[PDB]
């Protein structure tokens, strides 16, 4: 059946190539003959798929339909670009038939206990449908787009059941991967709707996005229940990043309604992530706890940048509040690290945070947002105080090397911040930094004293 | 004697370099002194050659004279370009003396039983003479060209005797190589005559070419008598290629008399090749038989292209008849291959032939030659019918894989041919091809059926 | 103490970077604060240097001060370019303090028996002082330049005592290296004075150069007394090259007074070198003796080129006399080599000399200096006669190969010389060369005869 498939697959491809020649030349008589030949090959291929399924080879069965569908979409593209509605009609009907077959192959795969293949089939199909949707969107074919958007919905429902299956199989990893990929594809489809200005499609997708998010949060819950806080974190981190990417599309397009929905989704993810951080701390994994908050903070600053550049004070407000909450958590993680006797990690957390705060400060300085800059400069001060206590700890631990490294890095970062103040002409910030610089110098000189006393 | 030679060779080169300075500056007094120094060195070198020969080192003796001759020709070039007839005279006399020595070294080599060296000496000398001839031709020095053309004749006669020797030694390989190289050099010389428009030189060369061809055909005969049909084929294949190259020169220059002679030579070679194919088949080597006809057909199509582009219907006619004859032979070789149980080779032959026919068809289509296209399209049909029977054979042999590959390749080639018809707007050809495409599809679907029945 | 140093070094660098921002922006208040911070760090660093010395780590102590000094000079550059005399003042005072420390570290190193480190410290310091001097020279700050030139003098005195120490330790190699490097640095400083037109600085440097030369000549004496004629040669060869480089500066600038002094220094070095050649010959090392004269001759020709291009007949006269003296020595070395049975070396010497003479001849020909060309053409003749006797020797030794090589090379060189005569139109030179060419040819033909008689 393998060879049988290969023959028909190659033939079909060659027929489509011949069809292209007929389409471009405008030879309807040849195109007719070829389109009839294409139909005959499809029927054969579907019987080969049947054979493969009867042989217990659902993998091959899937591959055949996947390739065929791709070729049909390629043929559809030719019809769309040429404006041949009759051919496009025939192909769109062929596409539907293949989809139905593929869904039965997915069913078979699930019955065989192969949820992995089942997922892969639907994931590929969905991607191909979105590609076909793009053709409909760009060409402005609402009838085709309608059909595809309905096909997309059906695939999503199947995928969610495959996610359910994966969870029932105890494979929360796969369950996550499916929803993560789907969400990404939905956002890509959303982008097409946003750029084209198709509010109806965007609506449908935004509803699909919401449904996926809810599923993902339950997968995160599952992961946490399985004692896999690492995966739980990864899921939310990826989701948050994707939400920010979607937010960017809303911000640039000026879609406040979508941005609202996403900003609410972002908030929900943050709350989950903070509970995962809590879990990690309860598990004695302060390292992961730190990494989660560090990544989140970076993503929040990136989102803040979008708000700052666009001039969205309402979003910036929300993010700046989220940033504050993360900072407080991070400082408690630093405390934890110090209590664990890990002054190294404690230092690294504050050093990274400070750098990120200075980066955020730069955005405030360049944009001229004194209110944000104020908040950040206060956050910077708080971090410095913590760092100096970590330096103290390091010295008490007999680690004058680390103590030095912390102050050296901090001083460098302060000078970088000073540069921003100097170039912008912000004497108030420069004053604060120059005072911070002095304090660090005094500490460093005491570390030098310590080093000398240690014979180093 | 080795060092002795090296010293004089280097000195002579340096003297020629000094001569160049005198020539370019126009210092006749210095040039005189150097030309006298050159003469003295030559006399010494000839005595070193004598010594080498007396030492039984004919190899060194040859090398000395070969290098000297090259240096003399380089010096001659300086005289020719500067227009110094007095120097050129002296050098041309020196060249003659060296040639006489070299011919005696060739004699020595032959007496030593070293026909290989003997050949190499004359081959190199001939090449150098042709290079010198080029200088005479471009400068328009008929007196020098005359002398060289006489020297060329003398070398040819020697080479033919070396070929005879090689054949008497049972070395038909060397005999072939000598004539092949000589023929190539003669064609190169012919090109110079053709481009310059020297009919007298071209005449002489064309007569020399004829003589070489006759020798080569006897070497082919020898090779066949030795049971070496492979070499016999290679000789005729190379010769034919060289004849077509010579034909191209005649076609582009518009020399119908030369083209006539070559086209007659081409015919004679074809007849020989077909007998070599017969021999190969009688030896049970259908592979070689196929390769010979495949190469010949390709060369004929290349020659046809020249006729088509130039618009020479008479040549094209002759070639198209030659093409037909080759096709008939190839189909019998396919039959043989099938009878030998080698359906793979049978397929390969027809596949290659079909591709070549389509390439020829392209030439007819682009040129608008409906008569040629007709003939080719009929040839294409005949090949298709054969291929379908080979597919049948393959299926009967239980080789559905090969059966598929044949039809897949054929279909691709038909689509390529269809493209030519579509772009040119030839509905009649497109019709024929589209019918051929349908027939192939039906076959392929039966091969798919077979594959499924085989459990593949 | 290592870490302690690293911390302060990094901090100081960062403070200077911050200072740069203040300087460029013109923020005197920030610059003030930083300059005070810089002072505090310096004081700490000097105590770390003290610690390092107390720990017996004079290496680290040196490294700290060397780095600090470099950073201070970088800061000074910022002050100089910005025109901040107040900052420059503070830095120049800091520079002085560091120098005093470094000199005590040098003292320590010497007391530890580490004259190598002692040298390295002063060498680096001197280089940094010259770099600082350059800044003063280009900016036109005579007050800073004065201070630096006094610092340079002090370092030189120290270095000469380190050279003395090295000699007392039996390390004439290091002693040489120190003076060689110092001299090079002095010439570089001289260049700055010459280009800027600072006769007062140039005077001081030229006096320093003289003092170094005297030391170097005593080191050469030492090396000779140690039986190390190789080192003795290398020292004078390098010195001579450096003197010629200094001469070039004088020639291009047109400073006859400096050129006079250098030309006298060149003469003194030549006399020393000739005595080293004598020594080498007495040691049975004719190879080294040759190499010394060959290099010297090349350097003299290079100096001659400068005289020729500048049109300085007085210098050219002196050099041409020096060239003659070297030639006479070389011919005696050739004699020695022949007496040692080393005809190969004898040949190589004359071959190289002849090539150099032809190169010198080219300069005379292109410049049109018939008097120099005459002298060289006479020198060329003398070398040829020697070479022909070396060829004779080689033949008598049964080495016809070498005999050939000598004449072949000579002939090539004669033709190259002939080319110069031909292009320039010098019939008198061309005549002489053409006669020389004839003589070589006759010799070569006899070598060919010999080779044939040898069966080669």
Residue numbers in the entry:
A (entry chain B), B (entry chain A), C (entry chain C): 1 to 456
What does the paper say about this structure?
Circular tandem repeat proteins (‘cTRPs’) are de novo designed protein scaffolds (in this and prior studies, based on antiparallel two-helix bundles) that contain repeated protein sequences and structural motifs and form closed circular structures. While these cTRP constructs have many favorable properties, we have previously noted that their ability to self-assemble from smaller subunits is compromised by relatively limited contacts and small surface areas that are involved in packing between repeats and subunits. Based on those results, we hypothesized that a new generation of computationally designed cTRP proteins with increased repeat size (corresponding to longer secondary structural elements that increase both particle thickness and the number of buried contacts between repeats and protein subunits) would improve both the energetics and the stoichiometric control of self-association. In this study, we describe the de novo design of thick cTRPs (‘tcTRPs’) with repeats composed of longer helical bundles that form a new underlying repeat topology and demonstrate their solution and assembly behaviors, their structural features via X-ray crystallography and CryoEM, and their ability to be functionalized with additional folded protein domains.
Having demonstrated the accuracy and behavior of a designed thick(er) cTRP (tcTRP) harboring nine repeats and a relatively acute radius of curvature between sequential repeats, we next decided to generate and examine a similar tcTRP harboring 24 repeats, corresponding to a considerably larger internal and external diameter and a shallower curvature between consecutive repeats. We therefore attempted to promote the closed toroidal form of this construct by incorporating a pair of cysteine residues at neighboring positions across each subunit interface so that a disulfide staple might lock the protein into the desired closed topology. Based on the tcTRP248 design, an alanine at position 5 and an isoleucine at position 7 (respectively located within the N- and C-terminal repeats of each subunit) were mutated to cysteine residues, with the intention of installing potential disulfide bonds within each interface of the intended tcTRP248 trimeric particle (‘tcTRP248SS’). Reasoning that the designed disulfide bond might only form after cell lysis and exposure to a non-reducing environment (and during that time, would compete with misfolding and fiber formation), we isolated the slowest eluting half of the final peak (corresponding to the expected elution of a correctly formed trimeric particle), concentrated the protein, and subjected it to a second size exclusion step and analysis (‘tcTRP248SS Run #2’). In that second run, the protein now ran as a single uniform peak at a volume and predicted mass corresponding to the desired trimeric assemblage. The structure of the isolated tcTRP248SS construct from the final SEC run was then further examined by CryoEM single particle analysis.
